[PDB]
Amino acid sequence: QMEEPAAHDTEATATDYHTTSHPGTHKVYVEL
Amino acid sequence: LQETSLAGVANQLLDRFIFEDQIRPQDREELLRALLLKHSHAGELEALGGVKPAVLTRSGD
Amino acid sequence: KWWSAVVEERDAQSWTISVTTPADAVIGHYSLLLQVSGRKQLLLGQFTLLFNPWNREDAVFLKNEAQRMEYLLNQNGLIYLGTADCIQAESWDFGQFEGDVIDLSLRLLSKDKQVEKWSQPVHVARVLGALLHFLKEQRVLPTPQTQATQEGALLNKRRGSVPILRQWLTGRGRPVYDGQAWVLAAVACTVLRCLGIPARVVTTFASAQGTGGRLLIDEYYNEEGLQNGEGQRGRIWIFQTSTECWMTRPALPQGYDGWQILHPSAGSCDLVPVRAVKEGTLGLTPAVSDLFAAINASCVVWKCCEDGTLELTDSNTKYVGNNISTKGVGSDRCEDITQNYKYPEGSLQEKEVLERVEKEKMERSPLYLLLKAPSSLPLRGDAQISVTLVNHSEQEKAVQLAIGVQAVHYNGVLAAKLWRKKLHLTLSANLEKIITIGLFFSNFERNPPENTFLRLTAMATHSESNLSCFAQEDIAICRPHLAIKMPEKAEQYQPLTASVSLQNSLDAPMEDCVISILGRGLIHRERSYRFRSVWPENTMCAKFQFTPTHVGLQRLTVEVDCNMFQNLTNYKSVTVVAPEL
Amino acid sequence: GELLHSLEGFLDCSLVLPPTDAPSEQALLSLVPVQRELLRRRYQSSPAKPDSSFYKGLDLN
């Protein structure tokens, strides 16, 4: 049967998505 | 996340919720429809005559 | 034509200026400052300057429009690997338009100190090639000697070209091992596309690297038909990649504008025109001879003996540097451009070029066999091969026939010994004889490594004389096909479904089957899923659902891992349009 | 994990005022030294990462 799979959490290749740019410091304006 | 509109952000967030079993697959449509409603502000309040809190429903009412 | 500023629109409180840039300016990070009569300098902002193929007056200028999109604005490319008989495409994510790629490239370029020359692409390309080759030599680790099949799925999987650049510049990621050292071309192409110079990665099959300028390659083979010892000075590689840059050469004589092959030397790099390699002008650039020798050279095989004396053998000619292929423009089909590097075989021009090069360089079998083998071998399967012998003599003769099968890496480095067989034949009265034998994965001494190709050698030794006949072929291992089903067109912000199909053609069931999906513009990052064991009889089928967000031509890539094999990848493209107003 | 750790640090440097029958001004103004000490404990570390911008050799030391 054409069946859906189940999730599988793994950090095997997470390091390949970490940027190197410095974000900086900024103020915030929060709205709810 | 690389998006520039609310629709894309909502779609990606709902996909992530479905991935991690936070919500059921059949709840995606209602949540997506509710998350894309118009966002009013303080100015229109007088034109609305007051507001009261509400709760979602499966039937849409 | 120089720096200028014209007021386009004037208002009561606001002004609109239109700044112009000269067609030959230093690239890099800029800063704009304003001077009034009385007060000091005031900083307005910062911006970056890049080359452009869209300007008719620039050195890097592409006339066609589709070529501009394919060679500069594309981020999803294809790299062709495998043997010259069967070519396997691999989906690569160049990712030249990421957030930090431009900053990293400029910071790496900032180690040149000849700022004045940053206005011409030749110097920048040469410096970047040399620096990237040095970084590759510094940061690429040798393959582990220990055997680890459990972790083998994590050593050979590639997620693109930006992680490699980040790990090379900063050393804070997963390193790349010696089994995959062809990624340097992809990294260089990514950087070059980022700076604005059109580039392309080409792959040449059966290229004779190693020796510098010579036209002869020496190979030594054992008595049983295998290769005793390991390594050599100059050997024939299975394939080799090389980046090309589109530009114009002003310092060279007229007629060499176009594509330039970027060839680093083990440092100082350089780039050479293609037409120079085609014609054979060796006195134009120091690297012309080295690249010319690597595309058309002849090899000779020496047969070792127990005594130790090397003896020449009559061997069937093997082709060197053939079927050069690259990605087609505007589609996903490979195109062969071997006509831009060599003249057609058996022509007057090619033999004239060869004899001219030889003249310039000079200043400074009663029986035969032939072998028919398949172009590919199914994994954990079998295939038939045939060897035929024809003798030319009045009297009969007995011969010793030996056949060997052994693994080899993509650069000629020995991997393991797999199979050997020796037998006796007797031919009489000028009769041809055919011997067809099977080849199985159940008869191998061990399991061949992950990314290797099989080499088949056949040697026939005459009993009366000493001369022997030799032949060799290269075979690649093919893995089960992974089918993807999806509509060709999709609408934005609407659900889309994909179907994945796989069939178990192996002899043992798969376990720990894990499949991952990813794609730029369709999914945020990769997603992984598990499955149940699949028996050799039945098949595996799966369904996924997602939602496109960006418009244009996207694609998704899926990857399958299990205990029998690792990193089985496939891709599929799709076109997504904007919603109806 | 980093966000969870930051939330734990946020919760470590917060203080609760139980219902006390003392006058409001005195009770609310008694919190200044304790809060000052807690914030001084909050800002003392401020560690994020060393200067690992690039491991360059530059061929000229």
Does the distance separating the beta carbons of C171 and D58 come in below 8 Å? no
* Shared domain check, C508 and C543: yes
Do C and A touch, counting CB pairs below 8 Å (3 needed)?
yes
Does the distance separating the beta carbons of A3 and C160 come in below 8 Å? no
* Shared domain check, C165 and C258: yes
**Category of C412 on φ-ψ map: left (φ > 0), alpha (ψ -120 to 50) or beta:** left
Q: Nearest CA of chain D to the CA of C180: how many Å?
A: 23
Q: Nearest CA of chain A to the CA of C379: how many Å?
A: 26
Contacts of A5 in chain C (CB under 8 A): 515, 529-531, 542
Residue carrying structure tokens 């040798």: C142
* Experimental technique behind these coordinates: cryo-EM
- For D17, phi and psi rounded to 5 degrees? -110, 110
Residue C143 carries which DSSP code? P
* Shared domain check, C275 and C229: yes
Q: Nearest CA of chain A to the CA of C187: how many Å?
A: 15
| Helical (H) or strand (E) element with C424 | strand C414-427
Contacts of B1 in chain C (CB under 8 A): 524
Residue C106 carries which DSSP code? H
Does the distance separating the beta carbons of C169 and D55 come in below 8 Å? yes
Cα dist from C210 to B44, B45, C193, C234, C297, whole Å:
77, 79, 29, 4, 12
- Integer Cα distance of C468 and C274 in angstroms: 40
- Integer Cα distance of C28 and C48 in angstroms: 6
Parallel, antiparallel or unpaired: strands C527-530 and C453-462: unpaired
| Interface contact B39, partner A, CB < 8 A | no
- Integer Cα distance of B33 and C256 in angstroms: 60
- Integer Cα distance of C107 and C127 in angstroms: 13
Q: Hey, what amino acid is at C435?
A: I
Q: Nearest CA of chain C to the CA of D19: how many Å?
A: 49
* Shared domain check, C304 and C385: no
Residue carrying structure tokens 């998704």: C556
| Interface contact C542, partner A, CB < 8 A | yes
Q: Hey, what amino acid is at D55?
A: Y
Contacts of B11 in chain C (CB under 8 A): 493, 547, 549
Paired tokens of C497: 């479904």
| Helical (H) or strand (E) element with C534 | none
Q: C12: how many CB neighbours lie within 10 A of its CB?
A: 4
* Shared domain check, C153 and C85: yes
* Shared domain check, C327 and C424: no
CB C526 within 8 A of CB C514: no
Paired tokens of B38: 């118009």
Residue C126 carries which DSSP code? H
CB C198 within 8 A of CB C65: no
Contacts of B8 in chain C (CB under 8 A): 493, 549-550
Nearest partner of C269 among C50, C112, C143, judged by Cα: C112
Paired tokens of C297: 């050279």
Which are the contacts of C165, defined by CB distance < 8 A and separation ≥ 6? C101, C104, C187, C190, C191
* Shared domain check, C277 and C159: yes
* Shared domain check, C513 and C413: no
Q: What is the CATH number of the domain that holds C213?
A: 3.90.260.10
CB C322 within 8 A of CB C236: no
Q: What is the CATH number of the domain that holds C403?
A: 2.60.40.10
Contacts of D61 in chain C (CB under 8 A): none
3-state DSSP helix/strand/coil % of chain A, to nearest 5: 10, 10, 80
Nearest partner of C86 among C305, C295, C323, judged by Cα: C323
- Integer Cα distance of C36 and C180 in angstroms: 58
Q: C387: how many CB neighbours lie within 10 A of its CB?
A: 21
Q: DSSP per residue over C339-374, as a string?
A: GGTSPPTT-HHHHHHHHHHHHHHHH---EEEEEE--
Nearest partner of C415 among C450, C384, C380, judged by Cα: C450
- According to DSSP H, which parts of C141-245 are helical? 152-155, 162-170, 183-195
Name the residue range of residue C370's domain.
Answer: 364-478
- Shortest CA distance from A9: residue in chain B: B20
| Helices vs strands, H then E, count in chain D | 3, 0
* Shared domain check, C542 and C428: no
Q: C405: how many CB neighbours lie within 10 A of its CB?
A: 22
Contacts of A21 in chain B (CB under 8 A): none
Nearest partner of C493 among C410, C577, C374, judged by Cα: C577
- Shortest CA distance from D53: residue in chain C: C170
Give the sign of the dihedral formed by CA C50, CA C53, CA C325, CA C216: negative
Burial bucket for residue C154 (CB in 10 Å: 0-12, 13-18, 19+)? middle
* Shared domain check, C285 and C214: yes
* Shared domain check, C74 and C214: yes
CB C424 within 8 A of CB C388: no
Residue carrying structure tokens 């307005």: C44
Q: C287: how many CB neighbours lie within 10 A of its CB?
A: 21
Q: Nearest CA of chain C to the CA of A26: how many Å?
A: 18
Contacts of C493 in chain B (CB under 8 A): 7-8, 11
Q: Hey, what amino acid is at C422?
A: K
- Integer Cα distance of C521 and C236 in angstroms: 41
Q: Nearest CA of chain C to the CA of D53: how many Å?
A: 7
- Shortest CA distance from D59: residue in chain C: C111
Nearest partner of C526 among D32, B56, D7, A7, judged by Cα: A7
- For B2, phi and psi rounded to 5 degrees? -100, 85
Q: What is residue C177's three-state secondary structure?
A: strand
* Shared domain check, C265 and C174: yes
Contacts of C547 in chain B (CB under 8 A): 11-12, 15
Nearest partner of C154 among A5, A17, A11, judged by Cα: A11
- Shortest CA distance from C538: residue in chain A: A1
- Shortest CA distance from D51: residue in chain C: C170
Does the distance separating the beta carbons of C493 and B11 come in below 8 Å? yes
- What's the reported resolution, in angstroms, to a tenth? 3.6
- Shortest CA distance from B10: residue in chain C: C493
